[PDB]
Design a protein around this nucleic acid. Sequence first.
DNA 1: AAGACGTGGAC
DNA 2: GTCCAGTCT
Length: 352
Amino acid sequence: TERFPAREFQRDLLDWFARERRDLPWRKDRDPYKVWVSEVMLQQTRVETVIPYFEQFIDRFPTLEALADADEDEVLKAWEGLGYYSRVRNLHAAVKEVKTRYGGKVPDDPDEFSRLKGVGPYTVGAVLSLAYGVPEPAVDGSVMRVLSRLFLVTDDIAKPSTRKRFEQIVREIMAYENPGAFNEALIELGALVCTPRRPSCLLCPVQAYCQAFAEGVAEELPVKMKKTAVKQVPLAVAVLADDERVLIRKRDSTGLLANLWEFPSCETADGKEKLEQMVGEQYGLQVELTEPIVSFEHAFSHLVWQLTVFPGRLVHGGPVEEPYRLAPEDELKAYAFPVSHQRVWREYKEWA
DNA sequence: AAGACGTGGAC
DNA sequence: GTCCAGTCT
Ligand code: SF4
Ligand SMILES: [Ca+2]
């Protein structure tokens, strides 16, 4: 970027930003903890989705120390529905490490902050630039689009060599007087103006510096790979009631939807049979199912569940063995369920 | 490294 | 219906 009028670019970008910057809950102050939380929540999740989750989370866990001391169950429930749930296990671990190793002070050194679980190259830039003024780039998906257009970067943005290129662009053009403002403005541009399709280039404060605008190829950029097809996964789910409460179980601490509660379920096309062999395997449990009541798909980034719900009734001769639990209906909202199984419940509840 | 890892705003 | 808003190791 040797012929790039960085100072004029910065002026124009940061004058636009002060006029148009959205009033968002995590912009109300620059507390390193609250900034960090918002930036974890914001990973692969849109601002408007995050807003109510951030507000509730901080009401519940208002300080790094208050989060570090909380039970893992209450932390997970606070994330219920947001997706990519290891973010919150990682953040939880990271705040405990900050509390013990760093005295409850978020490290302002990039290497030390990035060593915390959950903190990748985007989060280290976003948190340190915003809370501490550190001039680290905060290159997210939208920034990569903006910079690919401004500087006509025609390389696949998934490559490390492209990422290094974007990081180098940002270091050359950044306003070291206000790196947090500069980083937020590039993101904000990508969100309200330089959008994936039909960018509002005529409304764009940096149109004069944009090579893709000049050559007329904004919409061919950035260069990404088409997403491959994802495995579809037949999943039989059983909603069982003893009417004396409903049978649920907690998932594994590892892997998909770890530590979330679910209705008993089995992968397969004889769902009625496969589920009966499973539930009976448990201690003192006897079950008989009903005809299915609904079938629906639930998508993940890497696979797609094809859920088939089966209602049924239970008969326990005593305690229900871990990992299983009996829960009165009234008490289900207390547990953390994936969205797929939240739907399972709503479909079974209206089915009556 | 590749692939695992959730969900829905915005259109 | 399709895109796309990051980190693990
Ligand atoms: S002129 Fe258009 S393509 Fe270039 S930065 Fe602005 S909105 Fe994006
Ligand atoms: Ca890191």
